[PDB]
Amino acid sequence: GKNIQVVVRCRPFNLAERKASAHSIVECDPVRKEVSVRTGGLADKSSRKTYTFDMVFGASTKQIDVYRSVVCPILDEVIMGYNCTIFAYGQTGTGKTFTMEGERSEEDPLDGIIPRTLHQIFEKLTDNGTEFSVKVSLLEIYNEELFDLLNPSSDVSERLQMFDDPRNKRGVIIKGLEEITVHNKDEVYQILEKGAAKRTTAATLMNAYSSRSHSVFSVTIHMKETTIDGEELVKIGKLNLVDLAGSERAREAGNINQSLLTLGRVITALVERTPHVPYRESKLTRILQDSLGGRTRTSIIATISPASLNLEETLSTLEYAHRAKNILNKPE
Amino acid sequence: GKNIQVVVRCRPFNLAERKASAHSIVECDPVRKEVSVRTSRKTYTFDMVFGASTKQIDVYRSVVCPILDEVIMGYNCTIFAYGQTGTGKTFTMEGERSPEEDPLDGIIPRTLHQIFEKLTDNGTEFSVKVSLLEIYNEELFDLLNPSSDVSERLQMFDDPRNKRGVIIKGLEEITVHNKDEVYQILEKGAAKRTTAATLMNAYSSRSHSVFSVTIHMKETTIDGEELVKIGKLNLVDLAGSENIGNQSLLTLGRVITALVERTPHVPYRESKLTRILQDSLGGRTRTSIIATISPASLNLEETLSTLEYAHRAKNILNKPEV
Numbered sequence: 002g003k004n005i006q007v008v009v010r011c012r013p014f015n016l017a018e019r020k021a022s023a024h025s026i027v028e029c030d031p032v033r034k035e036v037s038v039r040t041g042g043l044a045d046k047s048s049r050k051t052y053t054f055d056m057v058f059g060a061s062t063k064q065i066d067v068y069r070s071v072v073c074p075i076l077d078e079v080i081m082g083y084n085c086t087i088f089a090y091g092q093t094g095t096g097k098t099f100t101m102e103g104e105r106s107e108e109d110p111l112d113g114i115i116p117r118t119l120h121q122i123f124e125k126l127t128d129n130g131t132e133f134s135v136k137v138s139l140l141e142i143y144n145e146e147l148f149d150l151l152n153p154s155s156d157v158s159e160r161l162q163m164f165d166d167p168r169n170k171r172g173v174i175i176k177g178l179e180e181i182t183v184h185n186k187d188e189v190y191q192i193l194e195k196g197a198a199k200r201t202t203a204a205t206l207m208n209a210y211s212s213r214s215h216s217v218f219s220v221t222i223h224m225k226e227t228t229i230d231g232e233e234l235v236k237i238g239k240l241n242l243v244d245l246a247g248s249e250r251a252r253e254a255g256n257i258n259q260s261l262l263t264l265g266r267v268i269t270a271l272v273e274r275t276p277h278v279p280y281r282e283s284k285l286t287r288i289l290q291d292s293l294g295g296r297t298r299t300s301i302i303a304t305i306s307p308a309s310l311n312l313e314e315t316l317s318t319l320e321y322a323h324r325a326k327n328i329l330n331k332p333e
Numbered sequence: 334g335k336n337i338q339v340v341v342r343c344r345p346f347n348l349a350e351r352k353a354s355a356h357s358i359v360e361c362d363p364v365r366k367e368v369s370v371r372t373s374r375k376t377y378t379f380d381m382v383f384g385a386s387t388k389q390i391d392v393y394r395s396v397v398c399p400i401l402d403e404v405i406m407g408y409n410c411t412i413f414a415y416g417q418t419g420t421g422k423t424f425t426m427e428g429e430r431s432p433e434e435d436p437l438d439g440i441i442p443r444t445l446h447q448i449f450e451k452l453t454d455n456g457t458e459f460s461v462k463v464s465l466l467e468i469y470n471e472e473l474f475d476l477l478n479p480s481s482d483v484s485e486r487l488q489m490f491d492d493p494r495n496k497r498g499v500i501i502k503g504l505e506e507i508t509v510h511n512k513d514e515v516y517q518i519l520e521k522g523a524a525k526r527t528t529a530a531t532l533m534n535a536y537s538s539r540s541h542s543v544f545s546v547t548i549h550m551k552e553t554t555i556d557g558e559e560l561v562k563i564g565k566l567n568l569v570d571l572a573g574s575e576n577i578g579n580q581s582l583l584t585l586g587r588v589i590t591a592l593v594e595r596t597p598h599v600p601y602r603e604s605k606l607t608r609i610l611q612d613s614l615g616g617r618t619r620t621s622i623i624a625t626i627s628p629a630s631l632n633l634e635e636t637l638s639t640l641e642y643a644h645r646a647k648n649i650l651n652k653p654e655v
């Protein structure tokens with residue numbers, strides 16, 4: 002019960018889990034906001050471990066219903082001119098990218114957050130008369146090094162440098178980052194497309210895999226609203242959509258442990274109001290600082306597998322989400 | 334190495350791999366017997382290397398035939414499939430039935446078809462028995478016993494005729510009276526494996542699966558010799574290599590290195606698996622490990638780990654380049 006929402010989304014079985022003879026160990030109960038996992042080793046059908054969250058989504062949960070519960074309330078905040086962040090956390094293949102982006106293959110029912118938010122920003126702002134402009138940026142953090150995914154020319158190993166700008170505190174300046182003007186609703190798709198192809202090339206040429214790196218898609222809205230006898234009103238607002246690296250050579254994995262672990266140290270600090278927030282201690286936390294501790298709405302989506310095969314990773318991601326906002330199991 | 338062969342079989346991409354837009358990170362060179370992984374590039378060399386287009390029949394022709402010729406002479410032999418869950422261990426050991434021999438038949442059914450075809454064709458007098466057990470959490474479960482219940486596990490004892498040998502009390506052995514009986518036999522085991530996973534949580538991906546075929550032979554030739562023999566083939570489908578980090582996989586590996594390098598101690602007694610199998614690993618015998626891997630970037634960490642395992646078990650120096 003705070004500005005920090007921690008929720009869990011369990012995916013359906015994949016084909017590999019079915020080929021492996023995996024069994025369902027995850028039980029999701031949306032009404033009690035609980036998730037339990039049968040933890041039993043040999044001959045133990047007794048032990049189950051429960052966790053309670055702000056929200057629990059089962060495997061049959063639709064995209065649009067994750068959007069309506071988690072994203073709408075954050076968008077309103079943004080439209081009022083605030084900075085907010087939504088994180089997808091979890092094991093590779095549990096649906097981080099699916100939640101954040103989705104796919105096409107009205108509103109395409111497989112759409113994730115990113116295309117859906119754009120469509121609403123446009124629908125809402127154009128309905129209520131607001132004067133506005135929409136900018137998006139997409140970068141990637143691999144090995145504590147930033148890479149612009151949207152820069153049309155300059156396709157290379159080219160890193161971006163980050164400076165702590167004297168101008169504003171809490172903030173940071175990334176020199177050279179492409180910010181693209183979004184001219185209309187459906188334009189997200191080709192922008193996601195361009196970022197994709199580039200992402201692919203950085204996978205093959207630098208072996209930087211999207212499963213090993215943080216993906217930050219930023220949208221900024223400039224709004225001007227006026228009403229007769231209504232006070233002309235000027236607002237900027239910012240929405241950060243972060244698709245994290247997998248939570249599951251030796252050097253760079255040590256690094257991804259450090260960031261997620263720091264991001265978590267940060268979220269725990271925000272929840273507790275316990276001062277001294279260690280934004281400093283990783284690039285990711287640094288890039289996002291202005292949208293985090295400065296009071297705001299913040300959300301974490303934790304993804305999980307239903308299968309016995311994934312039990313260790315599933316428990317870790319729930320141990321993690323739970324260390325982030327500790328909320329107690331309730332009786333009965 | 335000699336009678337210890339270590340080969341790799343890489344499987345084709347699967348769908349999750351295509352849809353993730355996974356990059357193929359291994360090159361398998363059959364001719365140079367090499368597997369390379371882009372990581373720069375790490376290259377390993379084996380006794381043989383099977384690309385993703387390798388058919389079951391070719392694996393068998395190449396790996397099994399010589400091992401089986403050896404079993405038919407009256408010797409005990411072992412073949413292991415090692416690798417990550419999903420890479421093809423069961424596809425290699427068993428195969429799949431499709432909806433002349435099913436081109437999708439793995440080692441177990443081809444071995445049984447060959448034993449029958451070969452031994453009746455030379456007019457040898459012979460009897461085939463098979464047994465199937467499962468190792469989970471250092472405990473033995475018979476998959477062929479029609480009776481009892483999920484929770485019953487087998488006890489082994491030292492064997493007074495054989496110091497390298499072991500007796501598993503109550504292990505069910507099934508006579509095979511013809512070629513195809515092996516299909517229904519494999520089906521009984523699967524049904525019981527399902528039960529044990531449901532009731533005991535012994536999950537198949539977490540379990541060593543040991544399929545042993547025993548052959549009794551009397552071969553007679555007028556003007557030649559009267560030959561009495563017992564052959565044994567153990568076909569072992571290991572637990573998923575991602576569980577490494579259990580010790581039984583690590584012990585198996587330490588035991589194979591000792592055999593290849595010949596160090597004074599070979600630690601068979603340090604796992605049920607090596608214990609069970611010590612009699613066919615007793616050296617001067619055919620032993621073969623098939624290491625299975627995926628080609629995709631998704632699976633890299635585990636593919637590297639499998640290759641390291643394979644390389645540590647038998648360490649072959651790389652030849653020179655182009």
Ligand SMILES: Nc1ncnc2c1ncn2[C@@H]1O[C@H](COP(=O)(O)OP(=O)(O)O)[C@@H](O)[C@H]1O
Pocket residue numbers: 011012013060062091092093094095096097098099100212304352
């Ligand atoms: N809730 C869900 N419903 C349907 N499909 C899903 C769900 N979550 C994940 N998937 C599917 O699982 C696969 C892997 O998901 P992906 O988002 O690529 O995972 P990650 O970002 O965690 O690596 C994709 O094929 C995606 O369609």
Ligand SMILES: Nc1ncnc2c1ncn2[C@@H]1O[C@H](COP(=O)(O)OP(=O)(O)O)[C@@H](O)[C@H]1O
Pocket residue numbers: 020021343344345385416417418419420421422423424425429625
């Ligand atoms: N070499 C191969 N050629 C064709 N299909 C394969 C191969 N290896 C595995 N497969 C397929 O991949 C899937 C998983 O195989 P499986 O044998 O269950 O792996 P494992 O038992 O090691 O977990 C199955 O659909 C199987 O048919």
Ligand SMILES: [Mg+2]
Pocket residue numbers: 097098099211212244
């Ligand atoms: Mg992803």
Ligand SMILES: [Mg+2]
Pocket residue numbers: 422423424538570
């Ligand atoms: Mg298997």
